[PDB]
Scaffold this active site. Structure first.
Site, PDB file in Angstrom:
ATOM      1  N   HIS A   1       1.219  34.968 105.562  1.00  0.00           N
ATOM      2  CA  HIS A   1       2.128  35.088 104.422  1.00  0.00           C
ATOM      3  C   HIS A   1       3.448  34.341 104.635  1.00  0.00           C
ATOM      4  O   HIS A   1       4.351  34.460 103.804  1.00  0.00           O
ATOM      5  CB  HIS A   1       2.512  36.555 104.116  1.00  0.00           C
ATOM      6  CG  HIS A   1       1.416  37.440 103.632  1.00  0.00           C
ATOM      7  ND1 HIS A   1       1.098  37.563 102.283  1.00  0.00           N
ATOM      8  CD2 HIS A   1       0.583  38.277 104.296  1.00  0.00           C
ATOM      9  CE1 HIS A   1       0.110  38.426 102.132  1.00  0.00           C
ATOM     10  NE2 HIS A   1      -0.241  38.877 103.358  1.00  0.00           N
TER      11      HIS A   1
ATOM     12  N   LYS B   1      17.355  33.366  99.063  1.00  0.00           N
ATOM     13  CA  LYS B   1      16.852  33.737  97.710  1.00  0.00           C
ATOM     14  C   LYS B   1      17.814  33.187  96.654  1.00  0.00           C
ATOM     15  O   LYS B   1      17.427  33.056  95.512  1.00  0.00           O
ATOM     16  CB  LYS B   1      16.642  35.243  97.571  1.00  0.00           C
ATOM     17  CG  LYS B   1      15.587  35.823  98.489  1.00  0.00           C
ATOM     18  CD  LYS B   1      14.198  35.635  97.979  1.00  0.00           C
ATOM     19  CE  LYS B   1      13.190  36.501  98.687  1.00  0.00           C
ATOM     20  NZ  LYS B   1      11.826  36.147  98.258  1.00  0.00           N
TER      21      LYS B   1
ATOM     22  N   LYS C   1      15.140  40.644  93.276  1.00  0.00           N
ATOM     23  CA  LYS C   1      14.369  40.511  94.505  1.00  0.00           C
ATOM     24  C   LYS C   1      15.288  40.731  95.693  1.00  0.00           C
ATOM     25  O   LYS C   1      16.508  40.765  95.529  1.00  0.00           O
ATOM     26  CB  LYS C   1      13.800  39.085  94.612  1.00  0.00           C
ATOM     27  CG  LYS C   1      14.735  37.945  94.196  1.00  0.00           C
ATOM     28  CD  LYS C   1      14.050  36.591  94.243  1.00  0.00           C
ATOM     29  CE  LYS C   1      13.223  36.244  93.013  1.00  0.00           C
ATOM     30  NZ  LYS C   1      11.766  36.437  93.260  1.00  0.00           N
ATOM     31  N   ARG C   2      14.672  40.815  96.871  1.00  0.00           N
ATOM     32  CA  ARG C   2      15.370  40.968  98.127  1.00  0.00           C
ATOM     33  C   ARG C   2      16.624  40.099  98.127  1.00  0.00           C
ATOM     34  O   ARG C   2      16.544  38.911  97.828  1.00  0.00           O
ATOM     35  CB  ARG C   2      14.427  40.571  99.264  1.00  0.00           C
ATOM     36  CG  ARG C   2      14.961  40.868 100.660  1.00  0.00           C
ATOM     37  CD  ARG C   2      13.900  41.024 101.743  1.00  0.00           C
ATOM     38  NE  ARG C   2      12.978  39.891 101.767  1.00  0.00           N
ATOM     39  CZ  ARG C   2      13.197  38.757 102.425  1.00  0.00           C
ATOM     40  NH1 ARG C   2      14.323  38.607 103.112  1.00  0.00           N
ATOM     41  NH2 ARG C   2      12.294  37.781 102.392  1.00  0.00           N
TER      42      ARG C   2
ATOM     43  N   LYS D   1       4.070  38.461  87.283  1.00  0.00           N
ATOM     44  CA  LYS D   1       4.179  39.629  86.374  1.00  0.00           C
ATOM     45  C   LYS D   1       5.059  39.245  85.186  1.00  0.00           C
ATOM     46  O   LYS D   1       4.737  39.631  84.079  1.00  0.00           O
ATOM     47  CB  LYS D   1       4.754  40.862  87.070  1.00  0.00           C
ATOM     48  CG  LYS D   1       4.179  41.182  88.433  1.00  0.00           C
ATOM     49  CD  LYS D   1       4.869  42.334  89.128  1.00  0.00           C
ATOM     50  CE  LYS D   1       4.632  42.331  90.591  1.00  0.00           C
ATOM     51  NZ  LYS D   1       5.707  43.006  91.296  1.00  0.00           N
TER      52      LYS D   1
ATOM     53  N   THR E   1       5.309  37.126  93.889  1.00  0.00           N
ATOM     54  CA  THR E   1       4.375  37.580  92.874  1.00  0.00           C
ATOM     55  C   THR E   1       5.097  38.111  91.638  1.00  0.00           C
ATOM     56  O   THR E   1       4.447  38.329  90.618  1.00  0.00           O
ATOM     57  CB  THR E   1       3.474  38.739  93.339  1.00  0.00           C
ATOM     58  OG1 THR E   1       4.338  39.672  93.971  1.00  0.00           O
ATOM     59  CG2 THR E   1       2.406  38.362  94.337  1.00  0.00           C
TER      60      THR E   1
END
Lengths: 830, 830
Positions: free
Chosen positions: B354, B566, B560-561, B676, B672
């Site tokens: 991953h 990011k 997100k994190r 969605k 992911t």
């Protein structure tokens, strides 16, 4: 009303739908869980129905607080009180099990230790059965006291595992939670009230155990507190840095309050843990009691009516903090004046004393209690000061000497300075027993003689001052658990000879057996009942002790806490004597001179009590030697049953012929196992003390074997010892020599015999008079032998025990408390 | 099949008979527990039915092991998959509640953290729904990672409380317990087998969470391990002496393995705790897997058939110890030879990678792992030695240089000595990623580009050697949780325009929306659906962030994190830019030049990551300032949603207009959430990396906003920086100055801006290229503005997202794993 069909579905429903196991097969552990959950369904309907009537009626409710409840297993007493025994047995057959094997999976609830705890458990059964609005409050101990292992080396201790999978009885009330504070600081707000801030904050969560009455819907609670801390108190920042132990300090600190019963308190840390336990129990319960009182009150809240709505019984001095805790809540939280809150506290709270001499009465270091409970210490100091002013107000100060006596004896604070006084390095303590007497409206002993001692010798001054607080409530045990459910064959007999099943409620009908004690058909049934019960025990002794015994032998039983003052050592010494005699006789002489016996011992030794532990090892070695000696065979077996608890009592007591209650005369307040033994037709041998006195009076002096020095002579005989005037009987020296001669194997018993010799010295000098009492004890065991060979006379005595046992129902005790102390009345649950 | 009537009774039955609360009233927390227990009844019938068919069939079963599952709430997905949504809603109405308020009481299961965990959760739904025999195995974390508090000071962390009252879903299997050993010593017995003795012994107990498939009875397990020690390990003797902490050392030690997710491992104690967690999970699971394999086998046990009966997927390298653990069991416990046990282990185990670059691949100190798992280290050393012999066998030793390269890169043990070799203080490590590649039969990446990188750059040598292990399985998410249940209004639309409800299974029918993307009735419904979802969010933002926003604004979402890579900082910087522009314009100009927006941020910062924590505080301060500025009003709101989790995603994603995926190009394997978002008709803005590439290709390049440096340029631009060749764009300097000017209040941001300046230095020098990408990012946000004002073009784009989303079903992913790696087949549960 359930029947076999619906119970069948119900067990299946729980097996599948409230599972605790894998879905394959229906093994016994799975079967017990599903069964108990099924029963709980019934208990819960009734518990909710009782709860609803109590809530709407808002009648006075009693609350029994205790550091211990010895609840035993719940399954059979619960299906019995519900009257579903037959239906559950048939349902289990349908699913391929039997009742008795399913009941065997249940661990005893490890919530108590000894008679103080079983008395509370008896009382809950009695309250529910008599329709009295009352609950129990205790702590939920995860590991009990200890589970007892009996090895080659004697007693070993292991943490109890009763909650390893969970209890299918208990009901968690996640919404019933109370904050408990320790340490911190007290200050005054601008309202003039005290505010207790800081310290350590924890939570006490409620776990109900439903207690069903016999043949009634009344189903009450034993509500147990378990201590915890919100998950928010887990210190993440610590945990993540590698300080895993610091991260959980608050949870570790909170949870341990409910690990074990009576944690060892030689250390500071142990003492702190004991105060924390007592306070948690008093605080959580009173918070719960008061909250229910406000809720039932609605808008019409008269604090004046609190003692008309609430009784709180303190079982011993462990609940003592109730007095200052209730005071705290009323004053600091509810805004009452001192006077109002003291009147209320006094008419609420009552004290039951359970100990004989003023040296086991609990006391706490002042400094310690001040650190842990600053506000409580303020309140106690104020109660002490009022007491001082009250004592000076009576008595006056013309005697000075008389006044000083009174002030010294009666004050709650020991080794303190008086407020004001007149005449022109010992550690400061708080006397809990003084507090309890001062702070409640009733004080009772637990037997006639005991309660007389409490008025005359424990608290004489308090009795001269407030004679009206002092009462007696003779203990009792429930005839549900202790006849109807543990001893079915005897129950069938009682029903036949008394004419109805009504005796379980109207236990006075046991008296109707007296006119039949010589009846030969009654006697034959009586013997078959006793034999049948002993056959069950033979199987049990095989699996638990490893020895195979015959049922055609007198079962001579001594089950209780192992202690030098309980005198197991005397019993075992008597056994060693007879075994020595047996060995110096022919086979033929052995059979003429001694009836066959199985001598059964059980009970736990406090783990750091070296001597008690040594007495256990002793009994096991005497048993290894006797039970393997081919000259003896089935003439004599000595077995020590590991892990005596309510379940073992329920097995042994129905089977017993003779039970031993042979403590040094004057050191028992009561005892209650002797009452259960009598109910089951056991004949007691014992000293004239405690409950033995009352048993002997009711069952008749011909149906009790008495021996030994009486209480009034102990003092003199111990003085004889000290001055060197004591002459040990030769038979006693025989046994001593025989043990040192190593006849019981390689273990060295010097340290043990040494406790019996010398004339002074902390743990020598035969303080409990084993050597003294020994001749009359061995003599009296020969009277027993002689009585047992006359089967007709023995049966007559056995029956008159059962016949003269009624007054020892805890139903009698509970009606007394209900009328004379608590002033509660039966409430019907239709 | 239940209906409203039987569900009504059922909730009432549980409320009264499986209570967790007081019996008064039916508040929401009580209602949720009773409801969930009711649903569990349904889950359990199906779980047992699935269990029974699997047991008798003994077909091949797959097992998905992961350090994390992000299960979310279970209630609505469970009643939906059972098709009882309507019946439970009506039953709740009857008892005076509504479904949505009851669902709101459920805590998210705190069993995971990020996308790795949600992927596993998606996969379980897909497996159950597709009738594939497979289970999940994970740890039962009591406190999750942390619950996020958003205060005046930014992020604070608090332990999760999800298990404070218990989970009504889980099923304890008291009879499913496996011993786990740590430390100790290995020796050889006279049978020539290794025996691992001593160390620390604990127990791993199973807790099943039933996972129901959509429109099928298949109901599988997520089986979670919780660690403990028998109550016998409580040291009474210590506890009683006052050493309360020593008394519980073994339980403290055991229990902490399952406290939190990813415990901080800068310390030795933290590293040890991580290995313990991984080992517990691999050992308990394999013991359970093997035990089920022996049970289903009966007397016909062929160990040869194990990999025909069992697949084990390693989700990342955390399950790596599976390889030596299976080897251990086969060899030491089952008696297989090395060769047989290695063939078996290889055909059983598969690895999913991953991560992008060979520096996050886990490694353990040799000495550490040797102390904790001596036997595992022996086995790894043997696997390493075979690898060495295998590498020498190919390649030969004519290149020496080539051979050395291969041996250095590929060996599992780093900084070790070769067995035998030819030429005539760095710490020894174990490379888990090398172990995983060597020890299984498949290795897959998680996107096209990613899996190509895994073959070309992570494990090139392994691919040259075993090209056939390497595969791709593009991630996916379930359209049950992520369309059908989170977004009802959009579901109603999909059913209408595609003709059936069949799309939830045959998700390729979403493609049938493409021909209607310009249809005006479809567009109108589409807009009302989006608006309705945003109205739900407006209420939620009010209670959670405290800001009131309007639904007639573009919802621009970045969840997100929180991490420098990011690039939340880029987004917020863009926001700060536009706000600066707004303020230097008239009211009228402000309205012409900028569409109204609500910019929603969420996600957690690693707690000791100072900068990430500082970015959170930043966003909150930018929001305090913008959201209170009366010149701005409802033109712009910036809100930070505390405690982003699956429940918050299910709320926000249906409502979203634009979602941001703007990590530095080349640092995402997949992601992911973007999938969605697409399914729900959100339009993505992002860099060309990870899942964005694949999304963009499917939804069409006109329905995706792309900007920024691409992966191939990162290297060059970072070199530009280092040499001093980088020219910061003035608009970027504007924002910088504006922050230092203190326009966002008194907090000092110097440390934060400093991360963007200099040319080198550990945490400076704008390593993630925020400054570089900033012009093309702010430019692209203006293209967005322009597209949003054309409501018709915007709707068309929104629809084509949903239309081009099918391939991102985890059903597609799961069929791929099932056929290409695990070789399992659907099993029907009639």
């Amino acid at each position: 009303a359930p029947d076999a069909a619906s119970i069948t579905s119900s067990i299946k429903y729980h097996a599948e739908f409230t599972p605790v196991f894998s879905p394959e097969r229906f093994e016994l552990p799975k079967a017990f869980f599903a069964t108990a959950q099924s029963v709980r369904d019934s208990l819960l309907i009734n518990w909710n129905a009782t709860y609803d009537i109590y809530e709407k009626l808002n009648m006075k409710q009693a609350y029994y607080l205790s550091m211990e409840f010895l609840q035993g297993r719940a399954l059979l007493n619960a299906i019995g009180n519900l009257e579903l025994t037959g239906a559950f047995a048939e349902a289990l057959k349908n699913l391929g099990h039997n009742l008795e094997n399913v009941a065997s999976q249940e661990p005893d609830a490890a919530l108590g230790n000894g008679g103080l705890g079983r008395l509370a458990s008896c009382f809950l059964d009695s309250l529910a059965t008599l329709n009295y609005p009352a609950w129990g409050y205790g702590l939920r101990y995860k590991y009990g006291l200890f589970k007892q292992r009996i090895t080659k080396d004697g007693q070993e201790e292991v943490a109890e595992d009763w909650l390893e999978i969970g209890s299918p009885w208990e009901v968690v009330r996640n919404d019933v939670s109370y904050p408990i504070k320790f340490y911190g600081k007290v200050s005054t707000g601008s309202d003039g009230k005290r505010y207790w801030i800081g310290g350590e904050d924890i939570k006490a969560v409620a776990y109900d155990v439903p207690i069903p009455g016999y043949k009634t819907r009344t189903t009450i609670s034993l509500r147990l507190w378990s201590t915890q801390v919100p998950s928010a108190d887990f210190d993440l920042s610590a945990f993540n840095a590698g300080e895993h132990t610091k991260a959980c300090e608050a949870q570790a600190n909170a949870e341990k309050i409910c690990y074990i019963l009576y944690p060892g308190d030689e250390s500071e840390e142990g003492k702190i843990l004991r105060l924390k336990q007592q306070y948690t129990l008093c605080s959580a319960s009173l918070q719960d009691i008061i909250s229910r009182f406000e809720r039932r009150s609605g808008d019409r809240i008269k604090w004046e009516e609190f003692p008309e709505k609430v009784a709180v019984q303190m079982n011993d001095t462990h609940p003592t903090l109730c007095i200052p805790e209730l005071m705290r809540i009323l004053i600091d939280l509810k805004g009452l004046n001192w006077n109002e809150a003291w009147n209320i506290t006094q008419r609420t709270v009552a004290y039951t004393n359970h100990t004989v001499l003023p040296e086991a009465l609990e006391k706490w270091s002042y400094e310690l209690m001040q650190k842990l409970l600053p506000r409580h210490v303020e309140i106690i100091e104020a109660i002490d000061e009022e007491l001082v002013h009250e004592i000076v107000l009576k008595y006056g100060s013309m005697d000075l000497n008389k006044l000083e006596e009174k002030l010294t004896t009666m004050r709650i604070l020991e080794n303190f300075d008086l407020p004001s006084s007149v005449a022109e390095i010992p550690p400061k303590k708080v006397r809990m027993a003084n507090l309890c007497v001062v702070g409640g409206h009733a004080v009772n002993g637990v037997a006639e003689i005991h309660s007389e001692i409490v008025k005359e010798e424990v608290f004489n001054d308090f009795y001269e001052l407030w004679p009206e607080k002092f009462q007696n409530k003779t203990n009792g045990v429930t005839p549900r658990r202790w006849i109807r459910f543990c001893n079915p064959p005897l129950s069938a007999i009682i029903t036949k000879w008394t004419g109805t099943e009504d005796w379980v409620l109207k236990t006075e009908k046991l008296a109707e057996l007296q006119k039949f004690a010589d009846n030969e058909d009654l006697q034959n049934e009586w013997r078959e009942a006793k034999r049948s019960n002993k056959i069950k025990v033979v199987s049990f002794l095989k699996e638990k002790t490893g020895y195979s015994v015959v049922p055609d032998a007198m079962f001579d039983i001594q089950v209780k806490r192992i202690h030098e003052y309980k005198r197991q050592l005397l019993n075992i010494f008597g056994i060693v004597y007879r075994y020595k005699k047996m060995k110096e006789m022919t086979a033929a002489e052995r059979k003429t001179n001694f009836v066959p016996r199985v001598c059964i011992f059980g009970g736990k030794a406090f783990a750091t009590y070296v001597q008690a532990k040594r007495i256990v090892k002793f009994i096991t070695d005497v048993g290894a030697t006797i039970n393997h000696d081919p000259e003896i065979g089935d003439l004599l077996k000595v077995v020590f049953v590991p892990d005596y608890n309510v379940s073992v009592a329920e097995l042994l007591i129905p089977a017993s012929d003779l039970s031993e209650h042979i403590s040094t005369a004057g050191m028992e307040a009561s005892g209650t196992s002797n009452m259960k033994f009598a109910m089951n037709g056991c004949i007691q041998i014992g000293t004239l003390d405690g409950a033995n006195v009352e048993i002997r009076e009711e069952v008749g002096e011909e149906n009790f074997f008495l021996f030994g020095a009486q209480a009034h002579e102990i003092a003199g005989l111990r003085k004889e010892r000290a001055d060197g005037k004591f002459v040990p009987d030769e038979r006693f020296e025989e046994v001593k020599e025989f043990v040192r001669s190593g006849a019981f194997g390689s273990y060295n018993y010097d340290d043990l015999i040494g406790s019996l010799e010398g004339n002074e010295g902390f743990g020598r000098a035969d303080y409990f008079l084993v050597g003294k009492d020994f001749p009359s004890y061995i003599e009296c065991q020969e009277k027993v032998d002689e009585a047992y060979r006359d089967q007709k006379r023995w049966t007559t005595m056995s029956i008159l025990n059962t016949a003269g046992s009624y007054k020892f129902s805890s139903d009698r005790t509970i009606h007394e408390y209900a009328k004379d102390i608590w002033n509660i009345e039966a409430v019907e649950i239709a």
